[PDB]
Design an enzyme around this catalytic site. Structure first.
Site, mmCIF file in Angstrom:
data_model
loop_
_atom_site.group_PDB
_atom_site.id
_atom_site.type_symbol
_atom_site.label_atom_id
_atom_site.label_comp_id
_atom_site.label_asym_id
_atom_site.label_seq_id
_atom_site.Cartn_x
_atom_site.Cartn_y
_atom_site.Cartn_z
ATOM 1 C CB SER A 162 -0.854 -0.896 1.434
ATOM 2 O OG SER A 162 -2.203 -0.667 0.553
ATOM 3 C CE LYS B 231 -4.458 1.554 -0.675
ATOM 4 N NZ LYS B 231 -3.840 0.456 -0.477
ATOM 5 C CE1 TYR C 64 -4.881 2.142 3.479
ATOM 6 C CE2 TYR C 64 -4.570 0.126 4.813
ATOM 7 C CZ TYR C 64 -4.339 2.038 3.255
ATOM 8 O OH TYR C 64 -3.356 1.392 3.178
ATOM 9 C CD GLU D 293 -1.484 6.077 7.785
ATOM 10 O OE1 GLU D 293 -0.705 6.051 9.353
ATOM 11 O OE2 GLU D 293 -1.621 4.707 7.690
ATOM 12 C CE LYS E 287 -0.853 4.362 3.295
ATOM 13 N NZ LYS E 287 -0.576 2.886 4.121
ATOM 14 C CB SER F 74 1.618 -5.666 4.356
ATOM 15 O OG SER F 74 2.047 -5.034 5.657
HETATM 16 B B1 LIG Z 1 -1.838 -2.252 1.707
HETATM 17 O O1 LIG Z 1 -0.530 -2.487 2.298
HETATM 18 O O2 LIG Z 1 -2.206 -1.902 3.115
HETATM 19 C C1 LIG Z 1 -2.587 -2.604 4.486
HETATM 20 C C2 LIG Z 1 -1.942 -2.430 4.831
HETATM 21 C C3 LIG Z 1 -1.057 -1.697 5.504
HETATM 22 O O3 LIG Z 1 -1.090 -0.640 5.386
HETATM 23 O O4 LIG Z 1 0.292 -1.877 6.405
HETATM 24 C C4 LIG Z 1 -2.082 -3.538 6.168
HETATM 25 C C5 LIG Z 1 -3.406 -4.489 5.981
HETATM 26 C C6 LIG Z 1 -4.007 -4.364 4.612
HETATM 27 C C7 LIG Z 1 -3.748 -3.638 3.737
HETATM 28 C C8 LIG Z 1 -3.998 -3.591 2.681
HETATM 29 C C9 LIG Z 1 -2.976 -3.305 1.384
HETATM 30 N N1 LIG Z 1 -3.026 -4.146 0.672
HETATM 31 C C10 LIG Z 1 -3.196 -5.504 0.595
HETATM 32 O O5 LIG Z 1 -4.281 -4.927 -0.355
HETATM 33 C C11 LIG Z 1 -2.277 -6.660 0.050
HETATM 34 C C12 LIG Z 1 -3.146 -7.598 -1.177
HETATM 35 C C13 LIG Z 1 -4.081 -7.704 -1.152
HETATM 36 C C14 LIG Z 1 -4.023 -8.768 -1.940
HETATM 37 C C15 LIG Z 1 -3.760 -10.492 -1.607
HETATM 38 N N2 LIG Z 1 -5.139 -11.297 -1.801
HETATM 39 C C16 LIG Z 1 -4.492 -12.618 -1.208
HETATM 40 C C17 LIG Z 1 -5.099 -12.583 0.391
HETATM 41 N N3 LIG Z 1 -4.589 -13.903 0.894
HETATM 42 C C18 LIG Z 1 -2.743 -10.150 -0.907
HETATM 43 C C19 LIG Z 1 -2.063 -9.015 -1.238
#
Ligand SMILES: *[B@@]1([O])OC2=C(C([O])=O)[C]=[C][C]=C2[C][C]1[N]C(=O)[C][C]1[C][C][C]([N][C][C][N])[C][C]1
Length: 359
Positions: free
Chosen positions: A64, A67, A150, A272, A312, A315
């Protein structure tokens, strides 16, 4: 009596290095930029099975933190006159005209206040037509603009509209326009075959090698890959926006403008934002389950902080990222790992390093 570069390497060793053993993380890159001087620290392996060391060429998934690039693209489009943040998505994605989601403006999409958009798209939304159908089927829940949740679909739709306003696919907006403008030559939405040897394996919680899989509006939500030198350049651009042409300068400043608050956290565009100095608990609260996973009523900004900092987290299933910078201290830090570690640990380790570095 110790050179500055050794002092900073020691601080990173003291605060970030132990996380490798604690969380069984194969590889890590940490960078610090202070007063326009860059310090790069690489640890471990970008691929365990190949015994390939993490280095300045290693490409990591930003999650993320992507973003932030979406927000910069939107700031760029806005200042070029291609969009207004008061517009609604149906002005650009015509099939959304006269649907309920066309009551939400572009700022509200970018800053997560539609009032009914979850963290992820539904599992079964995969194709372009399914994404369109998802937004056509969208109906409001909470009053628009009042609650922050979020959301990947929220800022993903913002990114899609920014691309439509620029008459290019979003991946091309970043790779042909925004990355070149920011001077980033090793950053990608799609890593080319000629660079795959530099793409780290990510590692899941069983320390099995993996990389991010395709998903709906993945590119604007979480789909950028980059190297430590490029991310230090990106921090450099955020510390010195007056060193870029007018449109990119204004775009970067757009991402620094706080829009509303949830308690001590200011939601800017992607970033943020916090009053500086910030207490550790302020920074940890920004990552709480209450803030990250639930809707929260927003309030107007009251104290417009003169001295501030931004951060920010990001993951993917196999990678962790954290970026933070403090303009009035002319300092910033980047952490990249090819295994997720708890966001709290990333924030704590960066806080310890940044507070200890001699000014
Ligand atoms: B993004 O990294 O923000 C985020 C955080 C953060 O800000 O650290 C923590 C938890 C979730 C999120 C969502 C964002 N990242 C993703 O969307 C991960 C992405 C989603 C699609 C995939 N689906 C597989 C599920 N096992 C996994 C990677």
């Amino acid at each position: 009596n110790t050179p500055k570069d050794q002092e900073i390497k020691k601080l990173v060793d003291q605060n970030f290095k132990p996380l490798l053993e604690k969380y069984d993380v194969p590889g890590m890159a940490v960078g610090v930029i202070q007063n326009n001087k860059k310090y790069e620290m690489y640890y471990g392996l970008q691929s365990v099975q190949d015994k390939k060391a993490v280095n300045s060429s290693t490409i990591f998934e930003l999650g993320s933190v992507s973003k932030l690039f979406t927000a910069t693209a939107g700031g760029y489009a806005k200042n070029k006159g291609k969009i207004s943040f008061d517009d609604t998505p149906g002005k650009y994605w015509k099939e959304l005209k006269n649907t309920p989601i066309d009551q939400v403006n572009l700022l509200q999409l970018a800053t997560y206040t539609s009032g009914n958009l979850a963290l992820q798209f539904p599992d079964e939304v995969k194709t372009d037509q399914q994404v369109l159908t998802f937004f056509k089927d969208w109906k409001p829940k909470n009053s628009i603009g009042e609650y922050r949740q979020y959301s990947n679909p929220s800022i993903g739709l913002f990114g899609k509209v920014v691309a439509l306003s620029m008459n290019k696919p979003f991946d091309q907006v970043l790779e042909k326009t925004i990355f070149p403008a920011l001077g980033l030559k090793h950053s990608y939405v799609n890593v080319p075959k000629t660079q795959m040897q530099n793409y780290a394996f990510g590692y899941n919680q069983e320390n099995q090698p993996i990389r991010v899989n395709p998903g709906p509006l993945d590119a604007p939500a979480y789909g950028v890959k980059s190297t430590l030198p490029d991310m230090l350049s990106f921090i450099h651009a955020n510390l010195n926006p007056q060193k870029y042409p007018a449109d990119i300068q204004r775009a970067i400043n757009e991402t620094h403008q706080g829009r509303y608050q949830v308690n001590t956290m200011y939601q800017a565009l992607g970033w943020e934002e916090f009053s500086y100095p910030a207490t550790l608990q302020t920074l940890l609260d920004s990552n709480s389950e209450q803030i990250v996973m639930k809707p929260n009523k927003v309030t107007a900004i009251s104290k417009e902080p003169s001295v501030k900092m931004y951060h920010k987290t990001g993951s993917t299933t196999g990678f962790g990222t954290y970026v933070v910078f403090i303009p009035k201290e002319n300092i910033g830090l980047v952490m990249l790992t090819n295994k997720r570690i708890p966001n709290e640990e990333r924030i704590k380790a960066a806080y310890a390093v940044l507070n200890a570095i001699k000014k």
